RNA sequence: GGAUAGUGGCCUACCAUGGUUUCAACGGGUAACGGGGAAUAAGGGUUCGAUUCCGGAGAGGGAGCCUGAGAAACGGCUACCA
RNA sequence: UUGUAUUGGAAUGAGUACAAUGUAAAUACCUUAACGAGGAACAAUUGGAGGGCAAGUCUGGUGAGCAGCCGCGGAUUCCAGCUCCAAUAGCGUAUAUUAAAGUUGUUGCAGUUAAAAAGCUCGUAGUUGAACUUUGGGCCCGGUUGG
RNA sequence: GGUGAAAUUCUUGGAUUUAUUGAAGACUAACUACUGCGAAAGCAUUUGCCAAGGACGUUUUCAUUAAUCAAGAACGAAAGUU
RNA sequence: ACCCACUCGGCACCUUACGAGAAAUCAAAGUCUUUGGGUUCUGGGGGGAGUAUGGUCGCAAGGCUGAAACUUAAAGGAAUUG
């Protein structure tokens, strides 16, 4: 324009015309104060609503579990020293589950003791507790091969709350300052796993043991997310009726139960309940979901994986052809692509190696908007709720009766399923290695995975994590030595994103188990296409100002012609293309972005579709 | 999700920091353990 | 005139029409107990003082009262509200 | 007489402990017989290395990370290893406040063109308001400090 | 007639143009400027009436009666309202 | 009426800068870190915004007074030049 324009601190009316196309309240001191008071009334009423569940003998019991980390201890010493401070000897037998009422704190406690021989039974016991009491020895320090693995495993499945306890520190008395030196060491060790806690009690002192007892009675535990969104109960008694109709009585602790649900027992699988009653009766009204799943030579094997993984780490996906081998018949299935992130590979491809189940598989899409929606309905439909004394009748196959034990001697526990979780789908897991598991893991090798209560034998497929616009990703032969990774298989879905633990059975080990890794249920996503990449390679050997010719990549003129269209690249990063076959031995000549030399190598990439394998329960 | 976290100001007295549009706070602790200790492998997070 | 340990609209009867204010009355706000003091050193200032000493007020919220030289007391009593 | 590496005697408390002292009785400090260092493992951390602002043309990887601000990266600013710098039994971060700040200005800001002189004149409260009245000169006493 | 070009319009009962006269409402050319007056907005043909004002001149008179100004008050282009 | 000298008051102009200023420039925009002649009004980075809400004046159109949450690292002034 060329003119110094007009200025004003606020817009002129001329400017506004071109651009074109209840009372406020003062808070008086009284009403300020009044609002704060009536807000506090809500908070206080809300705190009562939480606590009523534990309020007394009429309320629910709190579930305590004792876990000694050293066999030196004997768990009966732990419990006995606690019971003394209750100051009622009427409290203080051929059994490992105990119900106690404490007059001193008007509190109901259930104590469960696991059988320390059965490592897997420890996890199952601790999985249901509100409080886990860790026993430590002042005399002998925990062993890395067993004692620590208890702590590490419990953390990764999740713990409602934890207490550190000592019971025998006087066994190293000279002066109690020497006891304090040891106690400081144990606290520093314990805090490494549980940095929220800074105290370990000495039960040899009356003041500490009373302090522990008070806490168990008075304080509330944390919730466990994946558990409390389901229902669960612990059996007070079990009974059998005629193929069976197994009866359990106990207390509701989760979100709740409905007689039309499905019920999982961790050792035995899914079963249907037929009736419920409250200690009114509820019956399975047949407008219900149903039980349908659809609609020394080993040294050579270990050495093989050790050698193969070392090779794959140096020269990944490189392949050797051989003379008298047809490249077509070997490789015709491979499509060949410029870039996985840009290819239009179809998900539910019709190729014959695709599993027989496809329409048979459940597919969800928006897992997030599915998960939260399902829960909202489930909590509304609950019939029995926390603290209800209940009986339940369950369709129980009579031949499994040989596996039942008296619940007074062994933990028997019951979990409700979410509706579609019985159906199989494509599922995805995060995975990273256990604390020092340096062994090679082959992508096809079978593994046992626990996630939530249930556990399955799985053969995975490994891939790296990224957000490709098409969900196509490279299949990988072995688990990366360091990064987190994504593993894919077919299994029954979980909506709660339970933590997952990865291990392999090994009865040669003291705990019968070898621990491999941990992770999380990410999602069901069938679009998570895996492509098996292959690299062929050949040697450029003669060089001209406009073309280079390459040996050994192919051995027949017919093969050079059939694969002519796939682009070439150098590992030094130049691209190129086949011109034509030269001669009968399968030489070719090619053009590239620039100068090559015999110190470079010429490669080409090809890709094949992969599909997940199915999986089966484990016990 | 449903973790508990402790938050602190992102250093600019109520303004957002640098490149990041409208982000004013940074995480300091999760579940009662500090992120710096986790990053350097000094402590371990118990799940929930 | 009554009442009080005693002065005084402190209260009662009768009578007069006064009292404060742009030198900010009256009203509203304070995440306001006051002071000795604390941090920050060119000088002038700015910000803070629930808290070891001095003074005031209260004992879940309002009101009433016995004993005693002294209390409108709450590790004294009586009633209502929660 | 000063640096860089194989080798030798001396010195000591942290810690433990007889005793006395301490104290209402004790613990600890102060004192002390015996024991107590050679990778003297009896092993010091917390933040940084483009500029503001002390200190890397080092070297390997990569093409999500860093950054209060300016900026780096499709690498002196990311990640890893050497080396170097700063404070040190302490060092970093968030929020509030003071100084540097003459961005609250009495001391001490600014108003043509950068934020800011009211269209114009009258006028009450408020702040402010010309000059002038015993000045000069003598004579004693006289304290302090230095000649 | 009007435009870059053209059409609506007026006219052989005479348009446009020429001559002699008359009516109405508005305006005050050239002279007119680096000139004048007014608190600002603003003010230009002649003559009469009414009241006001600055500067100059002064060996007149009073003797501090003064400067700026919240509240309050007079005036205020063009367009706009009854 | 005009010419020459002087003087009070007024609208302007030319040259210069002991002075001042970021510079254009300025007889005041000078007598300022060597900072105090009297007195009135207004501003405190750019947007949200002359918006919302309350009041008050007008027949109406509208006038006067006038925020905050939130957002952002610049917006702006003078001058010469590739």
Strand proportion of chain B, as a percent range, falls in 25-35%
Q: Walk across the major sheet of chain B and give the strand order.
A: 1-2-3
Order of strands across the biggest sheet of chain A?
19-21-16-23-22-17-18-30
Percent of residues in helices of chain B: 10-25%
Structural class of chain A: alpha+beta
Radius of gyration of chain B: 13 Å
Organism (chain A): Saccharomyces cerevisiae (strain ATCC 204508 / S288c) (Baker's yeast)
Region (Disordered) (chain A): 1-35
Protein name (chain A): Ribosome biogenesis protein TSR1
Main location (chain A): cytoplasm
Give the secondary structure arrangement, pairings included.
The structure is cut from a larger assembly and holds chains A (619 residues) and B (48 residues).
Chain A: H1 13-19, H2 29-51, E1 62-68, H3 75-84, E2 97-102, E3 107-112, H4 119-127, E4 131-136, H5 147-157, E5 162-166, H6 176-193, E6 201-202, H7 206-218, H8 225-228, E7 232-234, E8 237-239, E9 244-251, E10 263-265, E11 269-271, E12 273-278, E13 281-283, H9 298-314, H10 327-331, H11 367-380, E14 389-396, E15 413-416, E16 424-433, E17 447-451, E18 454-458, E19 462-463, E20 473-474, E21 485-492, E22 499-505, E23 513-523, E24 530-543, E25 548-551, H12 557-562, E26 568-570, E27 575-582, E28 587-592, E29 602-610, E30 616-617
Parallel strand pairs in A: 1-3, 1-4, 4-5, 5-6, 20-24
Antiparallel strand pairs in A: 2-3, 7-15, 8-9, 9-14, 10-11, 10-15, 12-13, 12-14, 16-21, 16-23, 17-18, 17-22, 18-30, 19-21, 22-23, 24-25, 24-29, 25-28, 26-27, 26-29, 27-28
Chain B: E1 5-9, E2 25-30, E3 33-34, H1 35-39
Antiparallel strand pairs in B: 1-2, 2-3
The structure holds four RNA strands.
Description:
This is part of a larger assembly, with chains A (619 residues) and B (48 residues). Chain A is an alpha+beta fold. Chain A contains 12 helices and 30 strands. In chain A, strands 19-21-16-23-22-17-18-30 form an 8-stranded antiparallel sheet, covered by helices on one side. Chain A has a 6-stranded mixed sheet with strand order 2-3-1-4-5-6, sandwiched between helices. Chain A has a 6-stranded antiparallel barrel with strand order 24-25-28-27-26-29. In chain A, helix 4 runs parallel beside helix 5 (147-157). Chain B is mainly beta. Chain B contains 1 helix and 3 strands. In chain B, strand 2 (25-30) and strand 3 (33-34) form a beta hairpin. The longest helix of chain B has 5 residues, at 35-39. Chain B is elongated, with a radius of gyration of 13 Å. Chain B starts with a strand and ends in a 9-residue tail after the last helix. The chains are: A alpha+beta (619), B mainly beta (48). The interface between A and B is medium-sized, with 16 and 11 residues. The structure holds 4 RNA strands.
